[PDB]
C-alpha cells in the first residue's frame, strides 16, 4: 500500500500544483434534467453532443458564490477533484467558466444516493453495510495519505454506480491539511465531538463519520439524532450509544472503537493506523484487494431503465441557464 500510496502522492502533487482549466465549452453539452440543488448551485444530468455520453455537470453562479463568501471553497473543491484519482472517487472530466458561471463536468453515477436506497429498504444487512464500509475505509486511507481530510461523509453524499459500487464526489468541505484545522462544517449527525466542542481536529473525524455511517446503514437510523442540532450535539459529546439488538458483537465492538470520543483511543487514529480497522474482526470476511480491484460482487445492483434513465429520481424546478453578455467576477476565479 505504502508503495502504492507514495506513487499516488506523486501523481496528486503533479496535478495539485499544475492543475487544469478550460477543458471544454458549454455549447457542447445538452442539459437533460436537474439532479441536485442548493446554495452552491445545481448539479445537472447532461449529454455530450459529439459523443452522446452522460455526465453530471455542477453549475455555480459566480456572483452568488462571491456574495456567499464561497470563492475559496469553490476553487478548492474543483482543485481537489481534478487531482485525486481512486477507484471510488468521481472523476472530473471537464471544467470551464464563462462570463457568468463555473462548470464542473464529472462522471455521472446513475444509481443515485445510497440514502434513497437505505430509506426504502429499511436497514442494510451487516455484510451489505460492510461491503460499503470497506470501500469507504479505502477511500479515506487514500485521501488521508494525501493529507486531505474529507469531512462530509453521509448517505446522501454517497452514490452507487451501475456495478453497484460506491462513489464519493463532493469535496466542498475537503481540506488539504497535515495537522489540525478548526472550522465547523458537516452534518450534525455526522459531526465528531471535537468539531462540536470547538477543538482543533485532525483526520480522525473522518473515522468518527464512518462509525456513524456503518451504524446508520445497519440500523437504518443514526447513532445520535433528535429534534434539533443542539440536542444532537449534546447526545454526541456524551458519546453514549445504544445498539440495535441485532447488531453482532463484532459490529458493536468496531463501533465502540470508531465512535470513540477519546481521540487518543479512536481507531484509524491510534498508532497502527487504518489497519486497526482493516484488521477488525468485523472485516475478517473482507477481501481488501478484491474490493480495491472491484472483483467483489455488489450485494445490490441498480438496473437502469436505459442510458441516463432518471425516473427513480426526484424532480426539481428547471431554471434557465443564463450567461451574461458581460464578464462576472473575473479576477476572483482566474484560477478556475
Amino acid at each position: 500500500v505504502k508503495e502504492f500510496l507514495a506513487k499516488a502522492k506523486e501523481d496528486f502533487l503533479k496535478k495539485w500544483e499544475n492543475p487544469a482549466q478550460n477543458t471544454a465549452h458549454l455549447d457542447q453539452f445538452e442539459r437533460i434534467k436537474t439532479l441536485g440543488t442548493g446554495s452552491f448551485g445545481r448539479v445537472m444530468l447532461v449529454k455530450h453532443m459529439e459523443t452522446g455520453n452522460h455526465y453530471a455537470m455542477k453549475i455555480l453562479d459566480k456572483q452568488k458564490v462571491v456574495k456567499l463568501k464561497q470563492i475559496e471553497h469553490t476553487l478548492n473543491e474543483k482543485r481537489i477533484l481534478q487531482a485525486v484519482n481512486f477507484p471510488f472517487l468521481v472523476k472530473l472530466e471537464f471544467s470551464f467558466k464563462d462570463n457568468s458561471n463555473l462548470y464542473m463536468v464529472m462522471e455521472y453515477v446513475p444509481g443515485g444516493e445510497m440514502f434513497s436506497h437505505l430509506r426504502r429498504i429499511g436497514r442494510f444487512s451487516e455484510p451489505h453495510a460492510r461491503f460499503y464500509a470497506a470501500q469507504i475505509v479505502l477511500t479515506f486511507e487514500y485521501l488521508h495519505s494525501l493529507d486531505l481530510i474529507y469531512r462530509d461523509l453521509k448517505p446522501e453524499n454517497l452514490l452507487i454506480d451501475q456495478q453497484g459500487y460506491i462513489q464519493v464526489t463532493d469535496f466542498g468541505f475537503a481540506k488539504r491539511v497535515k495537522g489540525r484545522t478548526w472550522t465547523l462544517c458537516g452534518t450534525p449527525e455526522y459531526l465528531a465531538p471535537e468539531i462540536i466542542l470547538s477543538k482543533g481536529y485532525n483526520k480522525a473525524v473522518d473515522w468518527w463519520a464512518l462509525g456513524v455511517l456503518i451504524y446508520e446503514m445497519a440500523a437504518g437510523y443514526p447513532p445520535f439524532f433528535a429534534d434539533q442540532p443542539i440536542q444532537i450535539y449534546e447526545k454526541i459529546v456524551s458519546g453514549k450509544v445504544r445498539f440495535p439488538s441485532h447488531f453482532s458483537s463484532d459490529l458493536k465492538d468496531l463501533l465502540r472503537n470508531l465512535l470513540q470520543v477519546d481521540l487518543t483511543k479512536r481507531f484509524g487514529n491510534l498508532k497502527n493506523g487504518v489497519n486497526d480497522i482493516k484488521n477488525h474482526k468485523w472485516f475478517a470476511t473482507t477481501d481488501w484487494i478484491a474490493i480495491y480491484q472491484r472483483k467483489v460482487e455488489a450485494p445490490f445492483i441498480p438496473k437502469f431503465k436505459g442510458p441516463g434513465d432518471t425516473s427513480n429520481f426526484d424532480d426539481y424546478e428547471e431554471e434557465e441557464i443564463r450567461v451574461s453578455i458581460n464578464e462576472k467576477c473575473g479576477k476572483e476565479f482566474s484560477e478556475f
Binding site: 452534518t187 443514526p222 439524532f225 429534534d227
Partner: peptide, 17 residues
Amino acid sequence: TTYADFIASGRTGRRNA
C-alpha cells in the same frame, strides 16, 4: 422504541450540512 423516536424526530429525510 428507537425507530419510533427516529420517526418523531423529523430528521428522517435528507439532512443539510
